[PDB]
Amino acid sequence: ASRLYTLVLVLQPQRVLLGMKKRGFGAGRWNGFGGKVQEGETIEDGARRELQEESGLTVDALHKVGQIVFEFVGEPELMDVHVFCTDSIQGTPVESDEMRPCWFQLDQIPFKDMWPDDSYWFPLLLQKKKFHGYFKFQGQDTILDYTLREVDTVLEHHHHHH
Ligand SMILES: [Zn+2]
Ligand SMILES: [Zn+2]
Ligand SMILES: [Zn+2]
């Protein structure tokens, strides 16, 4: 069994918009925008939906930048995380109950305040490289093992319900 998720990085020439989880799981960490793809929606519509809900932003285009798989100890569920980035946004960023957007200069990324896997694949995203990655987690804060690879084109999964 896997669970289908999206993550969207709003990435501009000198800056990246992250959001601070205000409540819930992972509260107090900065991350990209996204969440679970629900039944009855496509991955890309779920990505657009979560970004609109969490930041109030609309996007003209999303670029498929990567795939990450998360495995946890104790959970048979795997997470299939489809990563996107976008340069072209409209609206002004405003917080939801769940998330508060804030801009960071690209050399000021707060990796100590983000999830540990971000230290690995965020550099590739910031180099405009496409990637596949896998991270085996223990609890919240501990990567047990991982693999990461750059790729030329990204990985179509052909989800036929999404
Ligand atoms: Zn489904
Ligand atoms: Zn992009
Ligand atoms: Zn997938």
JSON list of C-alpha atoms and ligand atoms in Angstrom, two decimals:
[
{"chain": "A", "resi": 1, "resn": "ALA", "atom": "CA", "xyz": [0.00, 0.00, 0.00]},
{"chain": "A", "resi": 2, "resn": "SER", "atom": "CA", "xyz": [1.13, 3.54, -0.83]},
{"chain": "A", "resi": 3, "resn": "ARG", "atom": "CA", "xyz": [-0.38, 6.96, -0.18]},
{"chain": "A", "resi": 4, "resn": "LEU", "atom": "CA", "xyz": [-0.31, 9.63, -2.90]},
{"chain": "A", "resi": 5, "resn": "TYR", "atom": "CA", "xyz": [0.94, 13.13, -2.02]},
{"chain": "A", "resi": 6, "resn": "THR", "atom": "CA", "xyz": [2.07, 16.36, -3.66]},
{"chain": "A", "resi": 7, "resn": "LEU", "atom": "CA", "xyz": [4.66, 18.95, -2.68]},
{"chain": "A", "resi": 8, "resn": "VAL", "atom": "CA", "xyz": [5.00, 22.32, -4.46]},
{"chain": "A", "resi": 9, "resn": "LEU", "atom": "CA", "xyz": [7.94, 24.71, -4.16]},
{"chain": "A", "resi": 10, "resn": "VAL", "atom": "CA", "xyz": [7.27, 28.30, -5.20]},
{"chain": "A", "resi": 11, "resn": "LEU", "atom": "CA", "xyz": [10.72, 29.25, -6.37]},
{"chain": "A", "resi": 12, "resn": "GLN", "atom": "CA", "xyz": [11.72, 32.65, -7.81]},
{"chain": "A", "resi": 13, "resn": "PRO", "atom": "CA", "xyz": [15.17, 33.82, -9.00]},
{"chain": "A", "resi": 14, "resn": "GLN", "atom": "CA", "xyz": [16.44, 35.04, -5.60]},
{"chain": "A", "resi": 15, "resn": "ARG", "atom": "CA", "xyz": [13.80, 33.61, -3.26]},
{"chain": "A", "resi": 16, "resn": "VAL", "atom": "CA", "xyz": [11.59, 30.69, -2.24]},
{"chain": "A", "resi": 17, "resn": "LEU", "atom": "CA", "xyz": [8.17, 30.84, -0.57]},
{"chain": "A", "resi": 18, "resn": "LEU", "atom": "CA", "xyz": [7.90, 28.32, 2.26]},
{"chain": "A", "resi": 19, "resn": "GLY", "atom": "CA", "xyz": [5.17, 27.91, 4.81]},
{"chain": "A", "resi": 20, "resn": "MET", "atom": "CA", "xyz": [5.26, 27.36, 8.53]},
{"chain": "A", "resi": 21, "resn": "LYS", "atom": "CA", "xyz": [2.97, 24.61, 9.75]},
{"chain": "A", "resi": 22, "resn": "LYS", "atom": "CA", "xyz": [0.88, 26.44, 12.34]},
{"chain": "A", "resi": 23, "resn": "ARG", "atom": "CA", "xyz": [-0.86, 23.45, 13.95]},
{"chain": "A", "resi": 24, "resn": "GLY", "atom": "CA", "xyz": [-1.12, 19.72, 13.50]},
{"chain": "A", "resi": 25, "resn": "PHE", "atom": "CA", "xyz": [1.54, 17.23, 12.52]},
{"chain": "A", "resi": 26, "resn": "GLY", "atom": "CA", "xyz": [4.97, 18.77, 12.06]},
{"chain": "A", "resi": 27, "resn": "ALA", "atom": "CA", "xyz": [3.85, 22.07, 13.56]},
{"chain": "A", "resi": 28, "resn": "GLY", "atom": "CA", "xyz": [6.67, 24.59, 13.74]},
{"chain": "A", "resi": 29, "resn": "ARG", "atom": "CA", "xyz": [8.56, 23.35, 10.67]},
{"chain": "A", "resi": 30, "resn": "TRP", "atom": "CA", "xyz": [8.89, 25.21, 7.38]},
{"chain": "A", "resi": 31, "resn": "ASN", "atom": "CA", "xyz": [8.05, 23.25, 4.22]},
{"chain": "A", "resi": 32, "resn": "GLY", "atom": "CA", "xyz": [6.66, 23.37, 0.71]},
{"chain": "A", "resi": 33, "resn": "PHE", "atom": "CA", "xyz": [2.96, 23.41, 0.02]},
{"chain": "A", "resi": 34, "resn": "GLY", "atom": "CA", "xyz": [0.88, 20.33, -0.64]},
{"chain": "A", "resi": 35, "resn": "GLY", "atom": "CA", "xyz": [-0.75, 17.30, 0.90]},
{"chain": "A", "resi": 36, "resn": "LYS", "atom": "CA", "xyz": [-2.73, 14.18, 0.15]},
{"chain": "A", "resi": 37, "resn": "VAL", "atom": "CA", "xyz": [-4.25, 13.72, -3.31]},
{"chain": "A", "resi": 38, "resn": "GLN", "atom": "CA", "xyz": [-7.85, 12.86, -2.61]},
{"chain": "A", "resi": 39, "resn": "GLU", "atom": "CA", "xyz": [-10.03, 10.39, -4.45]},
{"chain": "A", "resi": 40, "resn": "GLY", "atom": "CA", "xyz": [-11.69, 12.00, -7.44]},
{"chain": "A", "resi": 41, "resn": "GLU", "atom": "CA", "xyz": [-8.86, 14.45, -8.23]},
{"chain": "A", "resi": 42, "resn": "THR", "atom": "CA", "xyz": [-5.73, 14.31, -10.38]},
{"chain": "A", "resi": 43, "resn": "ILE", "atom": "CA", "xyz": [-2.28, 14.81, -8.90]},
{"chain": "A", "resi": 44, "resn": "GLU", "atom": "CA", "xyz": [-1.86, 18.18, -10.58]},
{"chain": "A", "resi": 45, "resn": "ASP", "atom": "CA", "xyz": [-5.28, 19.43, -9.46]},
{"chain": "A", "resi": 46, "resn": "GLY", "atom": "CA", "xyz": [-4.53, 18.30, -5.91]},
{"chain": "A", "resi": 47, "resn": "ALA", "atom": "CA", "xyz": [-1.24, 20.18, -6.11]},
{"chain": "A", "resi": 48, "resn": "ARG", "atom": "CA", "xyz": [-3.04, 23.30, -7.32]},
{"chain": "A", "resi": 49, "resn": "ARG", "atom": "CA", "xyz": [-5.73, 22.84, -4.67]},
{"chain": "A", "resi": 50, "resn": "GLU", "atom": "CA", "xyz": [-3.35, 22.54, -1.73]},
{"chain": "A", "resi": 51, "resn": "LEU", "atom": "CA", "xyz": [-1.35, 25.57, -2.88]},
{"chain": "A", "resi": 52, "resn": "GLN", "atom": "CA", "xyz": [-4.50, 27.69, -3.17]},
{"chain": "A", "resi": 53, "resn": "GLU", "atom": "CA", "xyz": [-5.78, 26.58, 0.23]},
{"chain": "A", "resi": 54, "resn": "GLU", "atom": "CA", "xyz": [-2.47, 26.86, 2.07]},
{"chain": "A", "resi": 55, "resn": "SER", "atom": "CA", "xyz": [-1.05, 30.08, 0.55]},
{"chain": "A", "resi": 56, "resn": "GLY", "atom": "CA", "xyz": [-3.98, 31.67, -1.30]},
{"chain": "A", "resi": 57, "resn": "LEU", "atom": "CA", "xyz": [-1.93, 31.51, -4.52]},
{"chain": "A", "resi": 58, "resn": "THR", "atom": "CA", "xyz": [-2.82, 30.49, -8.07]},
{"chain": "A", "resi": 59, "resn": "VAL", "atom": "CA", "xyz": [-0.20, 29.19, -10.52]},
{"chain": "A", "resi": 60, "resn": "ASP", "atom": "CA", "xyz": [-0.05, 29.27, -14.31]},
{"chain": "A", "resi": 61, "resn": "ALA", "atom": "CA", "xyz": [2.24, 26.24, -14.61]},
{"chain": "A", "resi": 62, "resn": "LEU", "atom": "CA", "xyz": [3.71, 23.50, -12.45]},
{"chain": "A", "resi": 63, "resn": "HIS", "atom": "CA", "xyz": [6.93, 21.76, -13.46]},
{"chain": "A", "resi": 64, "resn": "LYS", "atom": "CA", "xyz": [7.42, 18.12, -12.47]},
{"chain": "A", "resi": 65, "resn": "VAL", "atom": "CA", "xyz": [10.76, 18.25, -10.67]},
{"chain": "A", "resi": 66, "resn": "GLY", "atom": "CA", "xyz": [10.92, 15.02, -8.77]},
{"chain": "A", "resi": 67, "resn": "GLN", "atom": "CA", "xyz": [9.62, 11.97, -7.00]},
{"chain": "A", "resi": 68, "resn": "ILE", "atom": "CA", "xyz": [10.33, 11.05, -3.40]},
{"chain": "A", "resi": 69, "resn": "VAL", "atom": "CA", "xyz": [9.29, 7.88, -1.59]},
{"chain": "A", "resi": 70, "resn": "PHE", "atom": "CA", "xyz": [9.05, 7.92, 2.20]},
{"chain": "A", "resi": 71, "resn": "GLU", "atom": "CA", "xyz": [9.14, 4.67, 4.22]},
{"chain": "A", "resi": 72, "resn": "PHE", "atom": "CA", "xyz": [8.56, 4.60, 7.96]},
{"chain": "A", "resi": 73, "resn": "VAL", "atom": "CA", "xyz": [9.28, 1.93, 10.55]},
{"chain": "A", "resi": 74, "resn": "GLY", "atom": "CA", "xyz": [6.11, 0.43, 11.99]},
{"chain": "A", "resi": 75, "resn": "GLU", "atom": "CA", "xyz": [3.94, 1.66, 9.11]},
{"chain": "A", "resi": 76, "resn": "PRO", "atom": "CA", "xyz": [3.37, -0.59, 6.06]},
{"chain": "A", "resi": 77, "resn": "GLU", "atom": "CA", "xyz": [2.24, 2.52, 4.15]},
{"chain": "A", "resi": 78, "resn": "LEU", "atom": "CA", "xyz": [4.72, 4.07, 1.70]},
{"chain": "A", "resi": 79, "resn": "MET", "atom": "CA", "xyz": [4.34, 7.70, 0.66]},
{"chain": "A", "resi": 80, "resn": "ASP", "atom": "CA", "xyz": [4.57, 8.47, -3.06]},
{"chain": "A", "resi": 81, "resn": "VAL", "atom": "CA", "xyz": [5.38, 12.22, -3.08]},
{"chain": "A", "resi": 82, "resn": "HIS", "atom": "CA", "xyz": [5.16, 14.01, -6.42]},
{"chain": "A", "resi": 83, "resn": "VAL", "atom": "CA", "xyz": [7.30, 17.19, -6.28]},
{"chain": "A", "resi": 84, "resn": "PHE", "atom": "CA", "xyz": [6.56, 20.26, -8.41]},
{"chain": "A", "resi": 85, "resn": "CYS", "atom": "CA", "xyz": [7.97, 23.74, -8.60]},
{"chain": "A", "resi": 86, "resn": "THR", "atom": "CA", "xyz": [6.53, 26.94, -10.03]},
{"chain": "A", "resi": 87, "resn": "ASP", "atom": "CA", "xyz": [7.87, 30.39, -10.90]},
{"chain": "A", "resi": 88, "resn": "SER", "atom": "CA", "xyz": [4.58, 31.90, -12.10]},
{"chain": "A", "resi": 89, "resn": "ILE", "atom": "CA", "xyz": [2.19, 32.72, -9.27]},
{"chain": "A", "resi": 90, "resn": "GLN", "atom": "CA", "xyz": [-0.72, 35.13, -8.96]},
{"chain": "A", "resi": 91, "resn": "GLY", "atom": "CA", "xyz": [-2.28, 36.64, -5.85]},
{"chain": "A", "resi": 92, "resn": "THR", "atom": "CA", "xyz": [-0.76, 37.73, -2.69]},
{"chain": "A", "resi": 93, "resn": "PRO", "atom": "CA", "xyz": [0.41, 35.10, -0.20]},
{"chain": "A", "resi": 94, "resn": "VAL", "atom": "CA", "xyz": [-1.80, 34.87, 2.88]},
{"chain": "A", "resi": 95, "resn": "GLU", "atom": "CA", "xyz": [-1.94, 32.32, 5.65]},
{"chain": "A", "resi": 96, "resn": "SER", "atom": "CA", "xyz": [-4.59, 29.68, 6.16]},
{"chain": "A", "resi": 97, "resn": "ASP", "atom": "CA", "xyz": [-5.42, 28.04, 9.47]},
{"chain": "A", "resi": 98, "resn": "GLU", "atom": "CA", "xyz": [-2.86, 25.34, 8.61]},
{"chain": "A", "resi": 99, "resn": "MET", "atom": "CA", "xyz": [0.06, 27.29, 7.07]},
{"chain": "A", "resi": 100, "resn": "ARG", "atom": "CA", "xyz": [1.68, 30.74, 6.97]},
{"chain": "A", "resi": 101, "resn": "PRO", "atom": "CA", "xyz": [3.72, 31.64, 3.85]},
{"chain": "A", "resi": 102, "resn": "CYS", "atom": "CA", "xyz": [6.99, 33.54, 4.10]},
{"chain": "A", "resi": 103, "resn": "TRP", "atom": "CA", "xyz": [9.77, 34.24, 1.58]},
{"chain": "A", "resi": 104, "resn": "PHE", "atom": "CA", "xyz": [13.37, 33.21, 2.21]},
{"chain": "A", "resi": 105, "resn": "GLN", "atom": "CA", "xyz": [16.46, 34.24, 0.29]},
{"chain": "A", "resi": 106, "resn": "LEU", "atom": "CA", "xyz": [17.92, 31.20, -1.45]},
{"chain": "A", "resi": 107, "resn": "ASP", "atom": "CA", "xyz": [21.10, 31.29, 0.67]},
{"chain": "A", "resi": 108, "resn": "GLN", "atom": "CA", "xyz": [19.12, 31.67, 3.93]},
{"chain": "A", "resi": 109, "resn": "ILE", "atom": "CA", "xyz": [17.06, 28.44, 3.70]},
{"chain": "A", "resi": 110, "resn": "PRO", "atom": "CA", "xyz": [16.36, 27.37, 7.35]},
{"chain": "A", "resi": 111, "resn": "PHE", "atom": "CA", "xyz": [17.30, 23.71, 6.99]},
{"chain": "A", "resi": 112, "resn": "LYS", "atom": "CA", "xyz": [17.53, 23.30, 10.77]},
{"chain": "A", "resi": 113, "resn": "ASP", "atom": "CA", "xyz": [13.82, 24.28, 11.01]},
{"chain": "A", "resi": 114, "resn": "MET", "atom": "CA", "xyz": [12.70, 21.99, 8.15]},
{"chain": "A", "resi": 115, "resn": "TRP", "atom": "CA", "xyz": [12.29, 18.24, 7.72]},
{"chain": "A", "resi": 116, "resn": "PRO", "atom": "CA", "xyz": [15.64, 16.39, 7.57]},
{"chain": "A", "resi": 117, "resn": "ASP", "atom": "CA", "xyz": [15.20, 15.02, 4.05]},
{"chain": "A", "resi": 118, "resn": "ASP", "atom": "CA", "xyz": [15.00, 18.58, 2.72]},
{"chain": "A", "resi": 119, "resn": "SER", "atom": "CA", "xyz": [18.74, 19.01, 3.28]},
{"chain": "A", "resi": 120, "resn": "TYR", "atom": "CA", "xyz": [19.31, 16.33, 0.62]},
{"chain": "A", "resi": 121, "resn": "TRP", "atom": "CA", "xyz": [16.97, 17.06, -2.31]},
{"chain": "A", "resi": 122, "resn": "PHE", "atom": "CA", "xyz": [16.51, 20.83, -1.84]},
{"chain": "A", "resi": 123, "resn": "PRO", "atom": "CA", "xyz": [20.01, 21.46, -3.27]},
{"chain": "A", "resi": 124, "resn": "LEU", "atom": "CA", "xyz": [19.02, 19.57, -6.45]},
{"chain": "A", "resi": 125, "resn": "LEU", "atom": "CA", "xyz": [15.77, 21.52, -6.76]},
{"chain": "A", "resi": 126, "resn": "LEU", "atom": "CA", "xyz": [17.81, 24.73, -6.33]},
{"chain": "A", "resi": 127, "resn": "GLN", "atom": "CA", "xyz": [20.23, 23.62, -9.08]},
{"chain": "A", "resi": 128, "resn": "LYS", "atom": "CA", "xyz": [17.33, 23.00, -11.50]},
{"chain": "A", "resi": 129, "resn": "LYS", "atom": "CA", "xyz": [18.05, 19.26, -11.43]},
{"chain": "A", "resi": 130, "resn": "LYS", "atom": "CA", "xyz": [15.31, 16.63, -11.56]},
{"chain": "A", "resi": 131, "resn": "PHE", "atom": "CA", "xyz": [15.60, 13.72, -9.16]},
{"chain": "A", "resi": 132, "resn": "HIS", "atom": "CA", "xyz": [14.32, 10.48, -7.68]},
{"chain": "A", "resi": 133, "resn": "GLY", "atom": "CA", "xyz": [14.78, 9.89, -3.97]},
{"chain": "A", "resi": 134, "resn": "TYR", "atom": "CA", "xyz": [13.90, 7.44, -1.24]},
{"chain": "A", "resi": 135, "resn": "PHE", "atom": "CA", "xyz": [14.04, 8.07, 2.50]},
{"chain": "A", "resi": 136, "resn": "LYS", "atom": "CA", "xyz": [13.52, 5.47, 5.25]},
{"chain": "A", "resi": 137, "resn": "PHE", "atom": "CA", "xyz": [12.40, 7.28, 8.42]},
{"chain": "A", "resi": 138, "resn": "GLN", "atom": "CA", "xyz": [12.43, 6.37, 12.12]},
{"chain": "A", "resi": 139, "resn": "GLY", "atom": "CA", "xyz": [10.07, 8.62, 13.98]},
{"chain": "A", "resi": 140, "resn": "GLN", "atom": "CA", "xyz": [9.96, 12.23, 12.80]},
{"chain": "A", "resi": 141, "resn": "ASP", "atom": "CA", "xyz": [13.59, 13.40, 13.10]},
{"chain": "A", "resi": 142, "resn": "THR", "atom": "CA", "xyz": [15.66, 10.40, 11.97]},
{"chain": "A", "resi": 143, "resn": "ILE", "atom": "CA", "xyz": [16.60, 9.23, 8.48]},
{"chain": "A", "resi": 144, "resn": "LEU", "atom": "CA", "xyz": [17.63, 5.57, 8.69]},
{"chain": "A", "resi": 145, "resn": "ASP", "atom": "CA", "xyz": [18.70, 5.20, 5.04]},
{"chain": "A", "resi": 146, "resn": "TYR", "atom": "CA", "xyz": [18.22, 7.01, 1.76]},
{"chain": "A", "resi": 147, "resn": "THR", "atom": "CA", "xyz": [18.98, 7.11, -1.95]},
{"chain": "A", "resi": 148, "resn": "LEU", "atom": "CA", "xyz": [18.93, 10.11, -4.24]},
{"chain": "A", "resi": 149, "resn": "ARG", "atom": "CA", "xyz": [19.69, 10.42, -7.97]},
{"chain": "A", "resi": 150, "resn": "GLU", "atom": "CA", "xyz": [19.50, 13.17, -10.56]},
{"chain": "A", "resi": 151, "resn": "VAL", "atom": "CA", "xyz": [17.53, 12.33, -13.71]},
{"chain": "A", "resi": 152, "resn": "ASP", "atom": "CA", "xyz": [17.03, 13.86, -17.15]},
{"chain": "A", "resi": 153, "resn": "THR", "atom": "CA", "xyz": [13.24, 13.51, -17.40]},
{"chain": "A", "resi": 154, "resn": "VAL", "atom": "CA", "xyz": [10.93, 12.63, -14.57]},
{"chain": "A", "resi": 155, "resn": "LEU", "atom": "CA", "xyz": [9.27, 9.41, -14.03]},
{"chain": "A", "resi": 156, "resn": "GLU", "atom": "CA", "xyz": [5.62, 9.10, -15.17]},
{"chain": "A", "resi": 157, "resn": "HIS", "atom": "CA", "xyz": [3.70, 6.76, -12.80]},
{"chain": "A", "resi": 158, "resn": "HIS", "atom": "CA", "xyz": [0.48, 6.50, -14.86]},
{"chain": "A", "resi": 159, "resn": "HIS", "atom": "CA", "xyz": [-1.85, 6.62, -11.89]},
{"chain": "A", "resi": 160, "resn": "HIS", "atom": "CA", "xyz": [-5.12, 5.82, -13.59]},
{"chain": "A", "resi": 161, "resn": "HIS", "atom": "CA", "xyz": [-7.37, 6.99, -10.74]},
{"chain": "A", "resi": 162, "resn": "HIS", "atom": "CA", "xyz": [-5.53, 10.31, -10.45]},
{"chain": "B", "resi": 1, "resn": "ZN", "atom": "ZN", "xyz": [-6.53, 6.87, -5.26]},
{"chain": "B", "resi": 2, "resn": "ZN", "atom": "ZN", "xyz": [10.01, 25.30, -11.36]},
{"chain": "B", "resi": 3, "resn": "ZN", "atom": "ZN", "xyz": [3.08, 8.31, -8.06]}
]
